[PDB]
Amino acid sequence: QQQQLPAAMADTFLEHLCLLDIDSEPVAARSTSIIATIGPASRSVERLKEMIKAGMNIARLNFSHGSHEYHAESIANVREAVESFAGSPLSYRPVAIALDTKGPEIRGLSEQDVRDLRFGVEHGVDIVFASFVRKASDVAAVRAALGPEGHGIKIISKIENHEGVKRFDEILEVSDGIMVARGDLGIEIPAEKVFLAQKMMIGRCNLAGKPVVCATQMLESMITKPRPTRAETSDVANAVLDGADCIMLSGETAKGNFPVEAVKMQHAIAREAEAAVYHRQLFEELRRAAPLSRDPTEVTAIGAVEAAFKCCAAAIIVLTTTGRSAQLLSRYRPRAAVIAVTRSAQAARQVHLCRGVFPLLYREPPEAIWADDVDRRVQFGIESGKLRGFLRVGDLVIVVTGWYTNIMRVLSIS
Amino acid sequence: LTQELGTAFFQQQQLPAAMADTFLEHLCLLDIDSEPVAARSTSIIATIGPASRSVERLKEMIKAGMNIARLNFSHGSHEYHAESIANVREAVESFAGSPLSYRPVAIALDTKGPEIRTGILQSEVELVKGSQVLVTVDPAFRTRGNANTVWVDYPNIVRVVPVGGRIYIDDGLISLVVQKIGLVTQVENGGVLGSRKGVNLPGAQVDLPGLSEQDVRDLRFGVEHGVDIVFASFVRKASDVAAVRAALGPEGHGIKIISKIENHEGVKRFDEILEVSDGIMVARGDLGIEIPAEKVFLAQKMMIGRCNLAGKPVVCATQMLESMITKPRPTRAETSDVANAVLDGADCIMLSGETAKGNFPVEAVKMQHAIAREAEAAVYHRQLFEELRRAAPLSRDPTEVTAIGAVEAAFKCCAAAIIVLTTTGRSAQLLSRYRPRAAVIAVTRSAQAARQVHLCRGVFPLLYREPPEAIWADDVDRRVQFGIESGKLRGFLRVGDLVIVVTGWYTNIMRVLSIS
Amino acid sequence: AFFQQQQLPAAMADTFLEHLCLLDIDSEPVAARSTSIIATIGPASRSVERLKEMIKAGMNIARLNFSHGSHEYHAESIANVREAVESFAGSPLSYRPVAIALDTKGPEIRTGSEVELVKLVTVDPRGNANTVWVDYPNIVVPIYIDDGLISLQKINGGVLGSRKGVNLPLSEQDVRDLRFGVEHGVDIVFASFVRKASDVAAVRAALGPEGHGIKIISKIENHEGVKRFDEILEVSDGIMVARGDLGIEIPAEKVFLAQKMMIGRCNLAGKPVVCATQMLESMITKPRPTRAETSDVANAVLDGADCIMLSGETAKGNFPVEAVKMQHAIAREAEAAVYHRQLFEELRRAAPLSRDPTEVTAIGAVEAAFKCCAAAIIVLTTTGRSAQLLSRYRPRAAVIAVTRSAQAARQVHLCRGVFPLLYREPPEAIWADDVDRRVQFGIESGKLRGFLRVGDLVIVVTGWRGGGYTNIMRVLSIS
Amino acid sequence: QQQLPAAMADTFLEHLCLLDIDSEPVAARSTSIIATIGPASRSVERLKEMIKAGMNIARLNFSHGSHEYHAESIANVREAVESFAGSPYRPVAIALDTKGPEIRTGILQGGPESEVELVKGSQVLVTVDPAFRTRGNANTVWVDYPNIVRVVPVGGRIYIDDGLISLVVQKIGPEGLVTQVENGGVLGSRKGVNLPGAQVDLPGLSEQDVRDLRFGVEHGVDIVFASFVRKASDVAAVRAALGPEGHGIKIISKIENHEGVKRFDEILEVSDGIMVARGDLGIEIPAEKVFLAQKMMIGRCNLAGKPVVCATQMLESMITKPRPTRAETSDVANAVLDGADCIMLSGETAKGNFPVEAVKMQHAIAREAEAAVYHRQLFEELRRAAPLSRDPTEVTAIGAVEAAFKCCAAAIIVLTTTGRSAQLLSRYRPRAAVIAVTRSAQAARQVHLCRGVFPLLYREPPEAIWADDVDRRVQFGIESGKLRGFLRVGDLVIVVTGWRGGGYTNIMRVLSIS
């Protein structure tokens, strides 16, 4: 009856389109992360508190412009705004910080980039958006520059030119993820071909189970105007339907006049689009094209996803230290929300890259008997689901842990 | 097969993606180096205005790819449009001197439509947020407009907006929420209010008629001047389009009516509107004011899918390349929007201010032509044909049965074209519905049907001018030959190509034929 | 290497048609044979030493045909089976439970050396070539004899024997026999000529309060049973497609239509279905079957059948042990030939959503096993219900079912894919350890019988506590 | 009716769930029936009853019987067929099934009817030394195939007397093959030998087969069922005995052993079709594996669009009884659902007491089974797998069966001279009866090899103008259709013809019946 459910049960994709209902309200919480770019319009601590409230999950620091001192101020203001919501363990929203490299601008790996990457390690950024990646070797050079101290930082390679599109498979192999950087791409290849690059990369990253970001001009007109155009809302919604894990604001939040409204609008479009995904085809095709595995965590993850669909579970609660188990559930694009309980503050921030994943930083100290410790973390996950809406008593939930994460439990919520 | 067509053949127009066993794998195999060689088949509607009224501009626009010229009767005198129609025909008819290359151009009339308007002020006034404005239909205030009093020319507004309902003013610029009904309201979003501005009542069952007194005059002008198509504004139910069809009357019997779905009621009564219409416009401009902006894409995708399944033309409209009004290159959201209207299933895409008043009308037509051509090739025909078969009602219609056999035949052999002979357009429409990769070359003696089948994706109309042959078999054969030789000249057909020829003795014969 | 066995290339074909083209006679069926075999007891199979040979060859269910034989005869049948079963119990990792099914006489009609009837029926209480006595006085008729082979103004020739079956397109006897079965502990009733739900209720009534645990399999044998099938299935524990009478009651050429329908609807309902009668009929006198007969067995498995049956092949013929060996060899090859990709996918869609945590855990475990080519799903069950919910989604991995209930062990033979293992140790204080020991018994038993191998992966399915659902699924590496 | 609700289901499972013993089949039966001609079916009056019960193809088994005996069978068959001229008239094809190469043991010391017992576990020497040709005993078996000693290796197996005795080679040496009896039994004299999994280098044709194919040609048969085909060069041999044009005869290759199953694709490429020869396959490979071989071969033949025969023991018990077993009706039904174009009877028609009943029974089972095929999925899968084609006749064919499915057409009327046009429709398995109008008497017999093709022989001389001559042949198809129940006023039918005489079959037309 709601969240496009009658369209969910269509027997063909054609008929699923026909059953889309503008009065079927999205009920699930919004699962595609919003990356906002920081600038004069979004730098004060008070503006950042607003943006978070509107739905910003990841803060982008664009190292094309601005001195190390400038970006250090940006990072401090973001942390200040975030911590101002750390009243309670269950109210905390992690916010990730991504550093976007300058690269080879014109107005191998530049000496400026090596300094900026050392700055970002020294300040503990979670993510590097690496500009203009053309081949695997370029990724290797960024990882070397990050050094042993930046070992847990994720590398999202920016595909921006013809070479990088044609070497995509080798680039994705060694990357944590991809950004479809439509800005330079649409100067570097014919403008009319970008949607083809975009759809091919999103599809390949979905198949590989690695996050993919759609970027640049998604709501451009909102730099000067309070409502976006019809092409712009279409573009956000279709990025989500393509498969994107994240969507992005650049000038809209970094310099325009309605940064908070831009975040709200991407949040509003993403939630309508997630409900309009035809999971029936998506799940059969990922199952079918995904190879047999003997990784116990992958095997448990696909089993949990099947069981969640079967009982219309409101949520899968996953216990994870590195994010990996949450990333493997995200890949099968459940409709249930994936609540990832973690003690790793960095993994909590990074799992925003994965669609459908809501990170929960657990703070209580361990329990002597591991099974008690597991149960506390699981109840923590349940409590935050109740608070945040999408767990009613009576719901069934799937729980995923270890005892590798290799256990799946089906639990009805009292 | 390589032996006949080469290796390069099977690398082009996304054929490695076309043959994937899932939609996911079809996406993974799209390739920016696979060139789209088939001719662009989604028609382009361009609105005429000061940027595009000169005869020489219009020829450039025709060469760039414009197929349907849209006259927007929201503005302009009857005189003004008669000179639009005249310059269009003069540009179009300057290519008649070589029939093999002549491109028909349809002329469509987009109505002003039933409207809700504020009055004249006491100039400009400013509605400031928070303040309280009165909304009145007392005739004493038609001319007494102030920043706390607004008159509207729609008496029944007081009955169709409930308490807390919203009222939109000047393209959703200003907004008001009702507080009391005696309508006292509070400015939600404020701004400058001019005079005789447009009003929108999101979610309301407005009882304005299907057309306005000025529409009746405008439609009569259109029939008299021989327009091919009406885009009928603000269609909410079937009685609305029956009223447009009565106004056209007998002189206008064969004008196609494309109903513009602009508001919540129209979306919910879609099935009854599409059934008495020749087709649909997804009018996203007004629809983004009348429903939440973030739900327009749902309405778009629902309406295109339902038209596809019915087999009726569907136009996507409004703000596709908006930034090109001032800049020479579009945004990334804008090229994506055009490509995804085509992938969604649209028959036609449209330009408004990009061609009516902007600095780059020819370039915007070029841009839509280039994207469409790329998006057509990325269509996953495998899944689309199968699903259209798996849902579409078994047919005892001989012309439709022929149509599905010929499209399947064309897919089996990589046919370059389906060549069909039609007099109304109906046989080409039935072919267009199954979305062949092959071009549907429609040879007709009806000048008007040739213009009108531009509404159908995949159809290239050719106007045969020669008088009958005594033997019906030789006139048939002469008309196929005109399509072949037109097709070779335009680059749709090469020696060695296969083609499927569809003709009458209903059009119930298909033939497999080699070119030259 | 591993992808050469078990028809694995066929299993990953993108279409059904291409699955058939990839079937390969050199792909060896390594998985253990999971379709259960029912063997009818008779002079060719009632002795303790024959029963032992049958058990070793694959017999899972011993059928007592109560159309013939005294109560004293059948009680020694039961005792002879139990004695052969329990001679293997000094080796608990290899011990095979064997169930006992009672097949009722029902409303048989029969006639009273031989004679040629050439191309008069009385119920007056001495038959000859022109008179036939029938034990059904009330002929109702405005008539077939002997499995339909003779047909007939006076109340299609051939030889007429004696006491031949008669076809006309709950008795007091039936009631003594059902109560006899409860006294003697039978696991299953095959209830002849079921035509509606009321027929099953009457059986459950004659079974009474001591017999609440007995499963009831309704035999579909005539046109009415076929038409009211949905009603019958709803209230029965399962179905038998009794092709014998059905092929006389409706036209012989329509039986396969009824068989494929009943199997499909039983698969959809997750209830067990048996295919019965003449499957290897020529093996009654021959040491090897016909081409039509090995085909019938294989396609019964392909159709969806949970069990397959022998009657005269094992009750009276000269090669009973060979007939069991041959159903076993065929089912093993057919099981590997099933197209699970389509079957599992259609079972998902057609099947309701469920809130039952056991049903939900079960489908997750079958998805997990398919994803990693699990050799087995090890399930703990006391009633057999968890095992049966695993069996209805038709995994390729063996469902090894560990139970303490000796009756449940026997009764789960009805569910395709389930191997029952009876566990005997008294609990431990801690649920945790009691669980682990029963799992480990399953692993060790499975290693010993050739079901599991170091390096394999298994899915283990149990419950978080003792009174609740079966709602834990664990992926485990064999070591 | 025609199980049409089950036809419409969205899944295969649901299709099964909707089958209905009271949904009566209406369409004409499309799977051909081959009957083997022998003493129970040789008389002209008997063959008449057999044509009426539904025989389409008369098979002659040259494993037994003289040329004079078969000549007489052929004459009676043709006399019975010709008796129905003056026509509603069923063409009947004649197939020659060859004896084939064989391997046999020698004579035992005790002579022809003697027996000796080979005891499990004993040592038995298999020898080709001809001084044992008549001296076989319990420890020594002679065989007429010298190269057995170099084609069966240590570990290999030698089967004797229809698979009943089994020996495992233990040692190879100048005296022959030292075996151990794995399966013992009573051995007689001159018993058939099978070498499971061997590459047997016997030739494609026996001496007897050369004389019989010459007889086949001279008496004008339509079909050869060629025995023991292992490899393409065995087919090339059959074809050379038949000559350069092969006189039009169709070569249906019999797959009977392991080598042929594994070299199936190369055999099919050069054959007109296949017979699944389950009798010998069941000796040559484990009996429980034969359904695998059958399902693969039928599948591959459907893919390729070539005819496949299911053969042997389909209704065995009817040799003595008037009603078959439940496993036999099921076997017939499942060969149809599998996709077999043709089904067969051997002893059931050749020597049993119920030959007309057996034909009747296959007829009744095939009709029911044909209505139960799941055309939605089958058609969809035959489309995806069949490759692109620039052959105009094949392009028209797929266009025509898709049109036929769109409107639930009663029939496709096709004009064909060689049968090819009718075979390209048949490979897409339409529900619509394919009505093939031909002037060629031999193509009318031979299209019986294709499921769903009903031949009509046209005897009228050609009109002066092609378009007239075509319309008359089309009209003949309509009017015969009506008379024989294929179509009726109200139906749609597809009409497949050619634009020119001597060109491609490149036209399709949709017609309402009047």
From Swiss-Prot, chain D:
Annotated phenotype, changing K289N: In CNSHA2; Kamata
Enzyme class: transferase
Effect in UniProt of substituting I251N: In CNSHA2; Dordrecht
Result, substituting R445L: In CNSHA2; instability of the protein
Impact noted for substituting E113Q: In CNSHA2; Sassari
Keyword vocabulary terms for this entry: Allosteric enzyme, ATP-binding, Disease variant, Glycolysis, Hereditary hemolytic anemia, Kinase, Magnesium, Manganese, Metal-binding, Nucleotide-binding, Phosphoprotein, Potassium, Pyruvate, Transferase
Entry's family note: Belongs to the pyruvate kinase family.
Protein name, UniProt field: Pyruvate kinase PKLR
Native source organism of the sequence: Homo sapiens (Human)
